[PDB]
Design the sequence.
RNA sequence: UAGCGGAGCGAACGGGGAGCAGCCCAGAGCCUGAAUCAGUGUGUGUGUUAGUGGAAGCGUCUGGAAAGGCGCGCGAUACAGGGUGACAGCCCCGUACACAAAAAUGCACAUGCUGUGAGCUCGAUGAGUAGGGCGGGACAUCCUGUCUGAAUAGGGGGCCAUCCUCCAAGGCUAAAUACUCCUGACUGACCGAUAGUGAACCAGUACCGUGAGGGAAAGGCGAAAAGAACCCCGGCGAGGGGAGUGAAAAAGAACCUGAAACCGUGUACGUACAAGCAGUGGGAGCACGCAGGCGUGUGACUGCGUACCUUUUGUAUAAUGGGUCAGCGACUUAUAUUCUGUAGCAAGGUUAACCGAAUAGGGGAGCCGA
């Protein structure tokens, strides 16, 4: 009932990267999702002797609100909304707006 | 006092004391203020004084309440805020049908009162913020003033007069 | 109100409503075990304790970011509400609505079993009791520790009756009613961190007291830690300057906004021969800002000038109070009563409880007036 899973191609609806597409790396329990190549941040990670001897400025991906992304149809080329039906005993996701089963 | 309808363009004569009475601003001000004060829940307290829960309800004499209804109801006729139709109903409880049925009549903010409330009409108007639906028995002075226009069915006006005068 | 008492206390009858239910025993037979009530399964319904589906939006402008503006569409039995980088009916969670339970369990029935007896008939109809005596208690009245003692359809009430009404000396009894530690939902002309619970925060804590007990202060970076890599000064410090992150670092964790008292640095003017509530009227000069004077700041010199508050007849050639700033801090609510204003109806006015999901209407019991 999440409408988004770990492995899914999504398009950012709003934010610094509006319109960009990427693959969801993982979804956080706080209602946010990490998407490859989206919302890059520059963390100044200070070196620690035990691990990561090199320091430097490191670019990492920041979580994005789940409401800021939508499943990318890739057929119409635009964001889409997900509905839930009960198919063959397992309720799966389908694309509203032509109601196609993923 | 006869008003010309819209669809049938016929007339319905009513006592002038109902739809043709003078506007008692002091009386209406009292009754309208009374209704607003009656609805508030005055529950509060502190703990230099401290408040206690209180009842804001006021008494309105049975005859005095009707008198206020006559003045506002009559003012609607003089202000041409009262539209009377013989029939007003929708086939199905769909708000979309109600929207189309209203734009044709050129009504945006309207109070629709009927003699016998229809289930489809009530459900259809529930999601329209600017549209309210009442029954002839359930009319209210505050509602009659708030809405720009007031649609009444032929049955309703007959019932209202006997309930008022 | 009747009454009791001054101050105050305060019925009953009766009427209108809420809710209604009265039963068995005081003993036998017939008849059967038949209604009914309890225990107990068993079926169904209907909840409760998890959940499932759930409609409809794009373009462009500004911007760090669009939900905003503009434009053009759509859903609505769903425009409750919350979240999302600013304010979303159509992004997300929901909502209207429609469904859902292996198991436990509430509540109505249906039915199984158990225990229980209904129907009719006839009788009975509460004894150391009613009452009375004594001694006390409690206020002639009431209570009883003690002793005595009836009639029993006749007995018990209302100088005497009248007349009416009732049946003690056995027990059981639902509904309408009171309250809220606790749980849920909703609501607020309620507060918004000195407020609101003492406690928005690891608060009945820290702390105080032997103890019972008393009892605080303390919320906020940002949309996201992206919480400052690296360099420099320094003590391998503190702290800072760069750099970098970010829309913003004067958002840097001592983190939204950042007032006043209070403390400084800088600039302008005045001030080291001038006496006191420090201002006010006139006013030169200087500095700066604007066709020659005006403006702003300063104020040499000069006229006038017994701080304020409270007490007191009074401000006192008196006494009292205030270190300063900021925040808090006093005619509230209910009931009764009286007057004025105003509005309704009018010799009539108006209902209370309650019914009614219903502010309508009903309700005229009563109240005041004529």
Sequence:
């Amino acid at each position: 009932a999440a409408k988004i899973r770990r492995d899914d191609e999504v398009i950012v609806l709003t934010g610094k990267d509006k319109g960009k597409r990427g693959k969801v790396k993982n979804v956080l329990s706080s209602g946010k999702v990490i998407v490859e190549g989206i919302n890059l941040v520059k963390k100044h990670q200070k070196p620690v002797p035990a691990l990561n001897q090199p320091g430097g400025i490191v670019e990492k991906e920041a979580a994005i609100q789940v409401s800021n992304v939508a499943i990318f149809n890739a057929a119409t080329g635009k964001a889409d909304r997900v509905g839930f039906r009960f198919e063959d005993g397992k309720k799966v996701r389908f694309f509203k707006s032509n109601s196609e089963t993923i | 006092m006869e008003l010309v309808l819209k669809d049938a363009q016929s007339a319905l004569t009513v006592s002038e004391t109902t739809f043709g009475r003078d506007f008692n601003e002091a009386l209406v001000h009292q009754v309208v203020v009374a209704y607003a004060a009656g609805a508030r829940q005055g529950t509060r307290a502190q703990k230099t004084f401290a408040a206690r829960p209180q009842d804001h309800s006021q008494k309105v004499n049975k005859k005095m309440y009707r008198g206020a209804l006559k003045s506002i109801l009559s003012e609607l006729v003089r202000q041409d805020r009262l539209i009377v139709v013989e029939k007003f109903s929708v086939e199905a409880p769909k708000t979309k049908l109600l929207a189309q049925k209203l734009k044709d009549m050129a009504l945006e903010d309207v109070l629709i009162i009927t003699g016998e409330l229809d289930e489809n009409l009530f459900l259809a108007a529930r999601n329209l913020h600017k549209v309210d639906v009442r029954d002839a028995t359930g009319i209210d002075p505050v509602s009659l003033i708030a809405f720009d226009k007031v649609v009444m069915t032929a049955d309703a006006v007959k019932q209202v007069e006997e309930m008022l005068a």
Notes: The first strand of chain A starts at residue 9 and ends at 12. Chain A has one domain: 1-102. The radius of gyration of chain A is 17 Å.
